[PDB]
Symmetry: C2
Subunit: 212 residues, 2 copies
């Protein structure tokens, strides 16, 4: 590769320092060795997380737990710790705000996922009372889903609350948010674009055989 500290070519740390010597002297080889050592002293830091990430899934009822386990598992695929909590905006709004505050208060950057079926008040109340992002991921079913979703979507002014229906999608959206400030999350999202694209190529190659 070519590696420029501060994007400055004259600070090149790669083998180009050796390619560019008019004449190889043992003084020239010592500079090239220092450049290699400089890269070697820093490369292990690419494996280090520069930012903490956390998703908190808030569920209005334990009957939605299975939907919440899918989000949590999906967060694991992106290396993002994910906590489940039970709170109802309608039956325990005092407790919703207390739980919110525990996660707001410990310094760890957090995305909230609100999982509430029927009339989702949980995402709205959370969205209105935190500066952190909130994603509604309602556990919609074809029975009443067409009716229930509008409670997540049409909110009063001053509410940033987003909606992602896929539970794996809600984790992926939360990963995309953390990927702006965490290169390890970003890299899993980028590789995942590649791998999915490769899977399509491989599936099209297979099905293309039935056309001969």
């Amino acid at each position: 590769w070519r590696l420029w500290p501060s994007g400055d070519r004259s600070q090149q740390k790669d083998k180009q320092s050796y390619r560019d010597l008019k004449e190889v002297t043992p003084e020239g080889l010592q500079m090239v060795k220092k450049n290699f050592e400089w890269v070697a002293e820093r490369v292990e830091l690419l494996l280090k997380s520069e930012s903490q990430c956390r998703v908190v899934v808030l569920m209005g009822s334990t009957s939605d737990l299975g939907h919440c386990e899918k989000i949590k598992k999906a967060c694991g695929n992106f290396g993002i710790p994910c906590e489940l909590r039970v709170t109802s905006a309608h039956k325990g709004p005092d407790e919703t705000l207390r739980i919110k505050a525990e996660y707001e208060g410990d310094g760890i950057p957090t995305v909230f996922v609100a999982v509430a079926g029927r009339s989702n008040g949980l995402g709205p109340v959370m969205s209105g009372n935190t500066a952190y992002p909130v994603i509604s991921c309602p556990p919609l079913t074809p029975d009443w889903g067409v009716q229930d979703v509008w409670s997540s979507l049409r909110l009063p002014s001053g509410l940033g609350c987003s909606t992602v229906l896929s539970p794996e999608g809600s984790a992926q959206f939360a990963a995309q948010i953390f990927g702006l400030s965490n290169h390890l999350v970003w890299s899993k999202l980028r590789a995942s674009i590649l791998n999915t694209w490769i899977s399509l190529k491989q599936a099209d190659k297979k099905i293309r055989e039935c056309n001969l």
Copy 2:
């Protein structure tokens, strides 16, 4: 009329006491006079309210004020005092519960009307946190009303919250609740059934002329 204290005929207080005398003696006429006096000493109490009544209309935004004025005016027709307040379940849930508590705490029987457009969280949070009745009267319009109403209707278990779309209707429903314990409210509802029925008779009598 015939008036029986405790539904006991032998305690009759009306003119039947006079009709029933075998012979009118001046001792008989004094009993009849006491009966008339007994009714006369109590009749003014039929004009007295036996129970206090109050509606509190809670609105998430001052843009819904006109809808709230219609409920208040309609409460006046039933002789029920009606208060307007501004609170948002989503932007100020701490304040929603504090306001609720001021009305729960002063001993006056209260019906809450929650007026919230879009995703109504106000009726649900109120319904979940008071033993008093809550009525959602969302200011629906034909733009998004078909979508918005389901946020009032499909609630988690443990929520008694009702829905009445008409703003005059929400006051009438609140009157019907107070009419179970207040004879003056009941009487206005009963007379109103009669008067509306008479109006139909009169309108049918008019239109019946165009058929000759």
